[PDB]
Structure formats: C-alpha cells, structure tokens
Amino acid sequence: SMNPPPPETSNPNKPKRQTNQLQYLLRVVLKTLWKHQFAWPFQQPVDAVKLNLPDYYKIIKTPMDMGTIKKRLENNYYWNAQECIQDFNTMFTNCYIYNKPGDDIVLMAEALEKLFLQKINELPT
Numbered sequence: 001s002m003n004p005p006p007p008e009t010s011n012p013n014k015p016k017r018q019t020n021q022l023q024y025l026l027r028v029v030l031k032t033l034w035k036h037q038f039a040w041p042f043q044q045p046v047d048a049v050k051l052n053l054p055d056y057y058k059i060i061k062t063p064m065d066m067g068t069i070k071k072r073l074e075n076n077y078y079w080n081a082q083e084c085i086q087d088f089n090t091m092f093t094n095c096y097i098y099n100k101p102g103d104d105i106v107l108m109a110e111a112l113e114k115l116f117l118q119k120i121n122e123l124p125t
C-alpha cells in the first residue's frame with residue numbers, strides 16, 4: 001500500500017483566527033519541542049513505506065505529527081488552543097498505541113510530553 005495523504009493544514013470551510021494562546025503555542029511551545037534532541041521522529045508524518053510498516057495505518061487511523069501542527073499554526077488553521085493541544089496529545093497517544101511500554105521511541109515521546117505540559121503550564125495570564 002501507499003501512504004495516506006497527510007492531515008489537512010488548511011480547510012476553506014473551517015473558520016480560523018489568531019489568539020494570544022495560539023501565538024504562544026507556536027512561538028514558545030512548538031518552538032521548544034521542535035529544538036529538542038528527541039524531536040526528529042515527530043517532525044513529519046510517519047512514512048510507513050520507507051519504514052516498512054505495512055500495518056501502521058491499519059492500527060493508527062488518526063495520525064498526527066509536529067510538522068503538521070507547525071503548518072497548522074503558521075496557517076492560522078485553528079479556532080482555539082484546545083484544538084492544537086489535542087493534536088499534540090493525538091501524536092503522543094499514537095506512539096503509545098503502536099509501540100510498547102519502555103520502547104526507545106516511547107521514552108522519547110514521554111520526554112517530549114513532559115516538556116510539552118511544562119510549557120503549557122507556563123503560559124502567562
């Protein structure tokens with residue numbers, strides 16, 4: 001099988017706006033995670049063909065990655081911050097579903113998730 005198309009990063013039917021919280025998700029949260037030593041597996045959609053994972057998109061039907069999130073934020077795709085937080089949580093949960101506890105990539109996702117939650121908590125009033 002082919003790869004699926006990547007998640008949409010624009011949608012002409014979906015109202016969109018910029019908010020202070022979404023600006024913070026791009027300029028602080030995404031930027032901090034993107035620069036982390038463990039970011040690289042998450043910077044683009046899973047290429048199941050190149051990785052020889054014919055079952056990845058049989059198991060993972062809601063894919064997400066930080067390249068898609070970065071584009072969504074840059075494109076002002078979202079209406080609210082909780083939508084974008086959900087995209088990060090989908091990305092982490094996918095890793096935990098396909099892999100097993102204690103696997104290398106799971107420890108990498110767990111470290112990024114800890115940092116993600118710290119940066120969200122630091123959002124100033």
Ligand SMILES: COc1cc(C(=O)N2CCC(N3CCN(C)CC3)CC2)ccc1Nc1ncc2c(n1)N(C1CCCC1)c1ccccc1C(=O)N2C
Nearest residue numbers: 040041042044045046047051053094095098099104105106
């Ligand atoms: C461009 O994408 C990749 C490149 C590579 C790769 O071989 N390289 C070459 C070495 C590069 N490093 C050079 C040294 N640098 C210090 C770090 C980068 C990193 C990219 C491996 C996996 C890649 N993709 C990938 N994406 C997502 C993965 C995953 N792999 N992995 C790998 C599992 C351990 C690390 C990533 C997965 C493999 C099987 C099942 C699931 C996963 C998974 O859950 N995720 C999140």
